[PDB]
């Protein structure tokens, strides 16, 4: 299968990835307002498959730790969302056995969406309140199948977003972690044996987002 390695030690929160997702899929924009944060949209939704979360952590000296988290479906190796959807109707949630992509179909309309969202340890699924379809990042399975990078991976200027075969991405993740620790001694990989989107966090993953790891 395929894997993302997301090295957040290089993230500038440019939100290139957030826009590139919407441009590639031609997704609509949400109605947003500033409530005292750069973060927007404030959450994933049925029309937002990726948003960059902003968190300010206090640091004694002049500056802070500003933690950036471009959130997406982890495309779990053994996905609980599928386990839960398959009790109501197989085919609502399927696995691409070549890429590893976990894919919601239009049949998610005819399953307990509430229950499927609850099954996700990363709180990823979002429901269309009209159609009751579940939507999330689809790994740009489209592009990967046609030998292209996912839109958010290609657009990323910093080397945060990396993508390829699971063996080369796991090897990259271990080599990068050792280098990153010289600058960020508390750096860790997010649930690396269970998911296909392996985030490198510079510190406590829960400071990035409460569901950053299981």
């Amino acid at each position: 299968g395929k894997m993302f390695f997301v090295d957040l030690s290089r993230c500038t929160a440019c939100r290139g990835c957030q826009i590139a997702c919407k441009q590639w899929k031609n997704l609509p924009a949400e109605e947003t307002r500033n409530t005292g944060s750069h973060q927007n949209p404030p959450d994933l939704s049925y029309v937002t498959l990726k948003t960059v979360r902003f968190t300010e952590k206090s640091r004694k000296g002049p500056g802070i730790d500003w933690l950036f988290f471009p959130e997406q479906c982890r495309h779990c190796v053994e996905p609980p969302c599928k386990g839960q959807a398959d009790v109501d109707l197989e085919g609502a949630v399927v696995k691409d056995e070549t890429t590893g992509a976990v894919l919601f179909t239009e049949l998610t309309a005819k399953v307990d969406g509430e229950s499927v969202r609850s099954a996700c340890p990363y709180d990823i699924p979002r429901i269309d309140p009209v159609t009751k379809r579940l939507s999330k990042c689809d790994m740009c399975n489209d592009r990967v199948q046609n030998g292209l990078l996912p839109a958010c991976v290609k657009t990323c200027p910093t080397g945060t977003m990396n993508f390829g075969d699971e063996q080369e991405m796991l090897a990259l993740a271990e080599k990068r972690l050792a280098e990153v620790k010289k600058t960020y001694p508390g750096a860790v990989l997010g649930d690396p044996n269970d998911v296909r989107v392996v985030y490198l966090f510079t510190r406590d993953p829960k400071d990035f987002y409460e569901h950053a790891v299981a």
């Binding site: 440019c14 500003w66 600058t183």
Partner: protein
């Protein structure tokens, strides 16, 4: 295949936003409407490698936008609605308004009786967003009409950079390029938010860190840049010179300077004359009456040949290096800490990390932009860092240099084409009234009797002659010289610049304004004046993508359309991806881009709009005569046109230039019609034309070098990533300027592992050598008269050394360095008030950008995905100031200055802290200037309602980065 791209043609383009110059791939629906279906990165482009920030990644939404202008619109005087009209009506009537205004206002001779052949009744603004060929054509169209009031983005952006670096090194441009950042050992980002405003640049910043580089951010705010840096230090807005003056003192005390570089390649050794002095914030030769200095008092001591004397032992007390040591003695860490708000520990940490690059085989670079330029001391801010870089020997080396990060996609280009009041294309000055002949014009260029000084500007007569041949090929240069308008020698240059154009407009002195690809209603400092002043225009021509705050200033806030006489023409233009041409990026890479989609609706490329407009004016003069027609009638526009329309290729070939006759030059022989292979082969006798001598070498007999997509490199080139076969850069493809300073007197790199050039056998390998000659035979700064990096620079309006002056609105009442609080020659408009320690406006005000929006947001406020991320004007304040004023995070606040007020959403953040200035906490208020009243709903208006119409006495840049404000909860 992928359904979305299955029936679309692929074309390459270059991003229409920042001066990084990222490559695009455009997918266009094969037939029918012929619209773009997809825009994303070019994976083969050597700068971005397929990556795009959110502005670039959303170009599809900009291009295929249902709010874009469709056809010309006309607003009759006193009317409250637009009327759709034909291009025929629009261009015909504008041509009549130009002719009518030109005929009534045209001046052959000024009051002094000197020939000036100009109209002072029409001004033009824009644009760095046009192609290089359009910028060049536009300037020459305006100048053939006799305009002198010609300005664009550069005035209010990097205008201070040009004289700051020209004084220091000989040229005004970014010294290195984006890819080169990866070679640096220490990256200082200061007066810059590069992770937000040049995002793809951070690819190369982080690759430098991968190889052991220290990343330093110095900024009043903790930003998305600060988040990735090793060292963050706060600095108070307007306190840059103390910080930099402190580093000079630190370098000199601790002997961290590159001794051999300083001795051989800087003016350290030059003997300053006896008339130079400084005491209590004032240099010698101060004339208080006229608010200017007698710069003659700063002259060097010359030998009998007129060559400045040099003490190679650096012992003479009037040696530049000894006067330098004496000047910055006052900038001790305690005084610098007290005035900056930066702790002595933080200053020392930055100083030690950066000044470590004084070692020959270590390179330090500065990345700076508007945080340094947009001040009353903008030029001196940059001078101080230029001087630091010369002391450490960081100029001319890979991973070194002064990286002045240019703003718009083609602001480098638009400045190169002379869309500023003081310069023709290629930085040949606009003649003044006393330059009565081409001979006298050419007499002004200083000569050097030093056999090691190249003094390349001595070739100017070839460039001016070749420029006049490009415009007027049937006239002798000395005759065509009389066709072009001249400015008054008697006046300060700032009389002809942006802020004084708006002051004159406010007093009714302008009939006509071209707002051509600019939004001065939002982008100009003190915006309320600009909005009122445009009310005093008889006619306004706005050329842009969308209806906007400038096009529709007459139906703006507190305006009565019924009472506003201004006739307005809105002409809708094509987006970047709908046209062909070149754009020059920050590293001077002139990159060719192609048409993907057809023009939207009835929109036109600027090239076609300006050419058909000029043709109508020309045909009106051919029919009914009028004022001095020769410059209009005789202009060579045949070379601009192919198949009845603007020809970027033909214009680009004229800007490069060609032989008007069989010619022998530099030992070689050329047939009439051949392209000029470089500016080395231009002549002063009329044999050659060249629209811009910098472009000579860009489009030769070999083809369009700007269109080269060749990433192959020699091993030497590949070690530092010159990519010399990717597009073309002026001058003659020298990718790192001043690169003779990167080697010793035998031609051996200071840092062989990162060699820019090297002498091998009997030739320079690597980059193109910046100045011909064997090793050790030439001073390395060939565009300088004397040939040296200028530590002491006596050409600058407020002195040959940077000196701390407070912003014109400042939070302190006493300068700790002198008894001069403000720049003693600052550009100010008499009667305009400033809040100097005014209790009504106790907070520092500054303006800046976010990643997701562009300029006034005219473009990005129309793009739903960018609005999504940043929907509303905000106000960033500390928790300390939030508590003082009882403001909660997310509350509506009112920010006010002497000049206006607006409402914004409070962002209360630990990313801002108080500045402890002389032991007292000073609070700041930060605002994005990206918002305007037209769109979106609840977006807010421009931060420029608050900014002052005062600033730098060298370039007249407004002080939009340091003023004084109040903030109240609403």
């Amino acid at each position: 295949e992928l359904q979305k791209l299955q029936w679309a043609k692929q074309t390459t383009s270059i991003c229409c936003y920042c001066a990084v110059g990222c490559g695009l791939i455009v997918h266009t629906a094969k037939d029918g409407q012929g619209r773009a279906v997809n825009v994303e990165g070019d994976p083969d482009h050597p700068i971005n490698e397929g990556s795009l920030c959110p502005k670039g990644a959303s170009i599809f939404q900009l291009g295929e936008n249902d709010q874009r202008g469709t056809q010309p619109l006309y607003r009759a005087p006193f009317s409250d609605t637009w009327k759709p009209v034909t291009w025929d009506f629009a261009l015909t009537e504008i041509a009549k308004r130009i002719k009518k205004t030109r005929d009534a206002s045209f001046t052959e001779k000024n009051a002094a009786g000197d020939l000036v052949n100009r109209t002072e009744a029409i001004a033009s603004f824009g644009s760095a967003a046009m192609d290089n060929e359009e910028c060049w054509a536009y300037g020459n169209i305006l100048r053939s009409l006799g305009l002198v009031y010609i300005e664009h983005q550069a005035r209010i952006c990097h205008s201070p950079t040009v004289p700051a670096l020209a004084e220091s090194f000989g040229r005004g441009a970014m010294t290195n390029h984006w890819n080169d950042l990866a070679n640096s050992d220490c990256i200082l980002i200061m007066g810059s938010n590069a992770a937000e405003n040049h995002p793809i640049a951070f690819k190369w910043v982080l690759r430098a860190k991968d190889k052991g580089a220290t990343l330093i951010h110095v900024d009043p705010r903790f930003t998305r840049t600060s988040a990735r840096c090793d060292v963050y230090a706060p600095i108070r807005s307007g306190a840059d010179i103390p910080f930099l003056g402190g580093l000079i003192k630190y370098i000199l005390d601790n002997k961290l300077y590159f001794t051999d570089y300083v001795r051989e390649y800087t003016n350290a050794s030059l003997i300053v004359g006896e008339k130079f002095s400084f005491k209590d914030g004032l240099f010698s030769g101060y004339d208080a009456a006229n608010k200017k200095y007698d710069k003659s008092m700063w002259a060097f001591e010359l030998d009998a040949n007129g060559v400045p004397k040099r003490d190679p032992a650096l012992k003479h007390p009037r040696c530049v290096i000894n006067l330098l040591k004496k000047h910055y003695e006052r900038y001790n860490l305690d005084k610098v800490a007290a005035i900056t708000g930066t702790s002595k520990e933080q200053l020392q940490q930055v100083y030690k990390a950066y000044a470590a690059t004084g070692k020959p085989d270590k390179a330090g670079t500065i990345m700076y932009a508007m945080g340094w330029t947009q001040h009353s001391v903008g030029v001196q801010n940059i001078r101080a860092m230029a001087m630091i870089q010369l002391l450490l020997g960081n100029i001319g080396v890979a991973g070194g240099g002064v990286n002045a990060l240019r703003g718009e996609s083609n602001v480098q280009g638009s400045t190169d084409q002379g869309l500023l009041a003081h310069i023709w294309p290629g930085y040949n000055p606009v003649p003044n009234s006393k330059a009565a002949t081409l001979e006298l014009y050419n007499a002004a260029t200083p000569q050097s009797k030093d056999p090691m000084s190249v003094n390349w500007w001595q070739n100017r007569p070839k460039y001016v002659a070749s420029y006049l041949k490009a415009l007027y090929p049937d006239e002798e240069p000395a005759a065509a010289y009389d066709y072009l308008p001249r400015i008054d020698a008697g006046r300060k240059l700032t009389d002809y610049f942006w802020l004084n154009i708006f002051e004159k407009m406010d007093k009714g002195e302008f009939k006509g304004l071209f707002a051509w690809g600019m939004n001065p209603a939002c982008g100009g400092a003190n915006a309320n004046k600009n909005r009122k002043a445009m009310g005093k225009l008889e006619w306004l021509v706005n050329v842009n993508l969308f209806e906007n705050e400038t096009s529709s200033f007459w139906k703006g806030p507190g305006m009565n359309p019924a009472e506003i006489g201004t006739e307005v023409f809105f002409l809708p233009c094509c987006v970047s991806i709908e046209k062909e041409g070149s754009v020059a990026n920050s590293g001077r890479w002139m990159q060719w881009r192609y048409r993907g989609p057809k023009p939207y609706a009835e929109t036109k490329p600027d090239g076609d709009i300006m050419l058909d407009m000029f043709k109508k004016v020309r045909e009106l003069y051919a029919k009914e005569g009028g004022a001095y027609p020769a410059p209009i009638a005789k202009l060579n526009i045949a070379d601009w046109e192919e198949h009845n329309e603007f020809s970027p290729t033909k214009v680009a070939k004229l800007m490069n230039g060609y032989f008007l006759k069989d010619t022998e030059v530099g030992g070689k022989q050329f047939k009439k019609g051949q392209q000029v292979p470089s500016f080395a082969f231009l002549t002063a006798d009329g044999s050659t034309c060249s629209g811009n001598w910098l472009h000579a070498g860009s489009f030769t007999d070999a083809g369009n070098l700007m269109a080269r997509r060749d990433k192959t490199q020699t091993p030497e080139q590949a070690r530092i990533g010159l990519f010399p076969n990717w597009s073309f850069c002026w001058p003659v493809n020298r990718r790192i300027l001043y690169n003779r300073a990167s080697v010793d007197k035998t031609g051996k790199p200071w840092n062989p592992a990162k060699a820019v050039i090297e002498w091998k056998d009997g030739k320079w390998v690597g980059d193109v050598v910046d100045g011909g000659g064997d090793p050790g035979t030439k001073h390395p700064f060939i565009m300088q008269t004397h040939g040296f990096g200028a530590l002491y620079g006596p050409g600058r309006e407020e002195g040959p050394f940077p000196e701390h002056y407070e912003p014109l609105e400042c939070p302190v009442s006493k300068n700790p360095f002198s008894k001069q609080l403000h720049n003693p020659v600052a550009f100010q408009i008499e009667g305009e008030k400033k809040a100097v320690c005014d209790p009504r406006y106790p907070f520092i005000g500054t303006t800046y950008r976010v990643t997701e929006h562009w300029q006034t947001g005219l473009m990005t406020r129309r793009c739903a995905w960018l609005v999504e991320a940043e929907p509303q004007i905000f106000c960033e304040i500390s928790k300390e100031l939030a508590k003082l004023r009882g403001i909660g995070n997310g509350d509506t606040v009112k920010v006010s200055s002497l000049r206006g007020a607006l409402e914004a959403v409070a962002i209360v953040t630990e990313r801002i802290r108080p500045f402890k200035i002389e032991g007292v906490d000073v609070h700041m208020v930060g605002l994005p200037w990206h918002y305007g009243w037209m769109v979106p709903k609840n977006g807010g208006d421009t931060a420029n309602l608050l900014t002052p119409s005062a600033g730098d006495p060298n370039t007249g840049i407004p002080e939009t980065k340091a003023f004084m404000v109040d903030v109240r909860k609403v």
